[PDB]
Amino acid sequence: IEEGKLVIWINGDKGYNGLAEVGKKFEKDTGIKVTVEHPDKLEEKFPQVAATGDGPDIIFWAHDRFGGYAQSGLLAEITPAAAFQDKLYPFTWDAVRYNGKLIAYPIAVEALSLIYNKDLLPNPPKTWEEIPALDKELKAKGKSALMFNLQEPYFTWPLIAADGGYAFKYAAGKYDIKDVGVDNAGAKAGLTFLVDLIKNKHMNADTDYSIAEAAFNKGETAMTINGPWAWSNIDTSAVNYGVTVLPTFKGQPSKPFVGVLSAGINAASPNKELAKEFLENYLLTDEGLEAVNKDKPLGAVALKSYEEELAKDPRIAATMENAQKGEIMPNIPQMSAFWYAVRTAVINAASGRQTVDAALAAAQTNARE
Amino acid sequence: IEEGKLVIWINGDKGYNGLAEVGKKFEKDTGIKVTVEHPDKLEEKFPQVAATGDGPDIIFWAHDRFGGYAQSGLLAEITPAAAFQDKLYPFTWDAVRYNGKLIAYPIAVEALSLIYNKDLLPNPPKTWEEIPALDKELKAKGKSALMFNLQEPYFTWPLIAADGGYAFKYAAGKYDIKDVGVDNAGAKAGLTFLVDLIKNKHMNADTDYSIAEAAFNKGETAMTINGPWAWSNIDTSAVNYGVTVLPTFKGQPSKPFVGVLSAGINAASPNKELAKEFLENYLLTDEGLEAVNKDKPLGAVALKSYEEELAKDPRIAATMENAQKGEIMPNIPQMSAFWYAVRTAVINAASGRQTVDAALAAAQTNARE
Ligand SMILES: OC[C@H]1O[C@H](O[C@H]2[C@H](O)[C@@H](O)[C@@H](O)O[C@@H]2CO)[C@H](O)[C@@H](O)[C@@H]1O
Ligand SMILES: OC[C@H]1O[C@H](O[C@H]2[C@H](O)[C@@H](O)[C@@H](O)O[C@@H]2CO)[C@H](O)[C@@H](O)[C@@H]1O
């Protein structure tokens, strides 16, 4: 492959002439020649040549082939700025993400359509089952009902998949409830640091929600850790406060468990419709959420409309920054057992009833049950 | 629980008076009284009472508890219309999805942040490690560096998780390359229907891309199945055509494999920067994509700006309708083996060299090797 040139492969059925024009402008601007080719079976050829360090600088194809190319080490990992990545839909980036790395730029989403001649057939059939009859009608006019590519499985697949054909089954992401990471070295280091703060009287083991809030809001302490709901009381307070990213530990960002405030309907409630009505039509509106939010801030609401408006708040922006650095909380049943286990571990380690090692090791065992 | 009333539980730290006001409006509109309560330990109480068929009509909590509630059969499965579901961010719906069912309405996302008093501390510490020193300084002023709730593990967890603490390890959703669904009854039914169309001379097994396109564009056939790239040639043709949803089979929507045309960069290319420049700055622009699109339509482009403009096209709308009913293609290496397997099966079944059963059974084995 020549340096200071760009060779592009794209399939013949796509607008390679249009791409070539983009190449002409690139050449005009940069003096770098851009050669667009559409070889036969380019998608089969590319691996073969690319293995040998030869072939095009850029290959165009549906993403489905690229995992294979990546796995063979034929694709360079792409590194677009976050700014650029935001310009494309995330699901298209998912298509080109292989083993965590981006391996291609998404370009366009292609799906088969039923294309019909309005002059022969003003209302196309809504079922496949109608087509034989339609064909009978049309054959009497020396026409046929339907013809499409039967050589490529891509074209016949929609009908094959229709009643439950699939390629490979997608396994849901499970949670390993035997993989507990409370007693690993990361947890130990973190908690040890916390215990050390207490030991050096920088913090008091006795501190609870009330004490912490009152101390911060009385301007007795420089900083607190708390969620959106807390802001109301700080606004009440004469304290001029900022809401920011959590501090790093060992150069890693603090990783808060993210909650989704959520409204469940009692299975035993005879008022399910009413519950549905209230939540859907009253609470989950700009007006409803604003009412709650005005009392105590919710944070980043789940309703897109109001959230967009709320996101202007730098406190909410900080909320979301910390959210992204942290993890959404599992909703599995074992979560309560996990919480209880860590609660006890922290308390006992902080109070000095137990060492960090022993406390966490105990939590490990408790959380696993 | 009493019918024709609504009892709501929400934690005391959230804005329950504001919620109550939403309840007052609901009552005004519907005459249904809404009682908002904030019991102590409501999250522990709810399961207890709910088991007995009693408790609030609606329970509010972070999603983390709801899996547990669901598992105990305390929550009614919620059924919002797709229209409503689109109004909330999907990741919040994920939080409330348990064993495939929605079990709660997501309300708002909460994350702990560092809150600091700008008047005491204009620049908050970017690391935990600075805090001891900061505290020393502040104690000499009769203040402390940090105080927060140590009694709830939620507050200490960010530091514990920071350096690699985790609850339970989350296993990413795999693709099972041993679970192949080409020879299931849905695939058999679909392909059988196709073979039957050929057997009844409604279609010719020999029909390929060229033949199909030429036939439709010459107004010889009522319908073809094809992608956006095909439209150019039909516009050229005097044919008056529409682009629509694929027909249903056995009252199921056709499920086309969705491809994302994507551009990968050759790992062996010395021109990687140039490739990056061209793709990012020339192709993936309104202008670049318009150039390609004008030659042969791309469909729904991945670039948000241009896509929004393109979406006005009813052909693209139909494209997206079909896309949503179908599935994005896996990008895994085994995809090529899958395609090859189906290609052969279809050809052999259509040509009549093999029966649908034998062809698909063979494809099954070939796809899983
Ligand atoms: O067939 C033309 C059309 O389909 C393509 O799908 C291919 C797939 O990408 C290949 O790897 C192949 O082995 O099987 C499929 C067709 O059976 C492309 O996805 C698409 O862009 C192209 O226009
Ligand atoms: O702790 C109060 C504050 O955090 C909560 O997180 C809880 C969790 O929800 C509970 O079930 C518990 O066992 O563990 C965590 C605290 O350890 C809520 O998620 C949050 O909204 C609440 O305001």
Residue numbers in the entry:
A (entry chain B), B (entry chain A): 3 to 371
What does the paper say about this structure?
To understand the molecular basis for the observed dimerization, we crystallized the protein fractions corresponding to the dimeric species of MBPeng-KFLFAK and of MBPeng-KFLPYK2. MBPeng-KFLPYK2 crystals also formed in P1, however with different cell parameters, and diffracted to 3.2 Å resolution. The six KFLPYK2-fused MBP molecules were in the closed maltose-bound conformation, as expected given that 2 mM maltose were included in all purification and crystallization buffers. During model rebuilding and refinement, it became apparent that adjacent MBP molecules formed the same intricately interlaced arm-exchange dimers in both MBPeng-KFLFAK and MBPeng-KFLPYK2 crystals, (harbouring two and three dimers per ASU, respectively). Instead of a tight β-turn at residues 173–176, the protein chains adopted an extended β-strand structure, crossing straight into the second MBP structure for both MBPeng-FAKKFL and MBPeng-KFLPYK2. This β-strand pairing is stabilized by six intermolecular backbone hydrogen bonds between residues 171 and 178 of both chains. Because MBP’s polypeptide chain goes back and forth between its N-terminal and C-terminal lobes, this chain crossing resulted in highly intertwined dimers, where the two domains of both MBP molecules are constituted by both polypeptide chains. This structural architecture produced an extremely high contact surface between both chains (~11,300 Å2), corresponding to a calculated solvation free energy gain (∆iG) of −174.5 kcal/mol. Following structural refinement, clear electron density was only found for the Asn-Ala linker and the first (in the KFLPYK2 crystal) or the first five (KFLFAK) passenger protein residues. MalE is a close homologue of E. coli MBP (94.32% sequence identity), and with an RMSD of 0.35 Å over 365 residues MalE was the closest structural match in the PDB to our dimer-swapped MBPeng-KFLPYK2.
The Maltose-Binding Protein (MBP) is a component of the Escherichia coli maltose/maltodextrin system, which regulates the uptake and catabolism of maltrodextrins as part of the chemotactic response. Subsequently, this tendency to crystallize has been further increased by an MBP version engineered to reduce surface entropy13(MBPeng). Here we report two passenger protein sequences that promote the formation of an intimately interlaced dimeric form of MBPeng, featuring the largest interface area observed to date for domain-swapped proteins. The fragments of interest being relatively short (28 and 49 residues for FAK(residues 805–832) and PYK2(residues 790–839), respectively), we decided to produce them as C-terminal MBP fusion proteins.
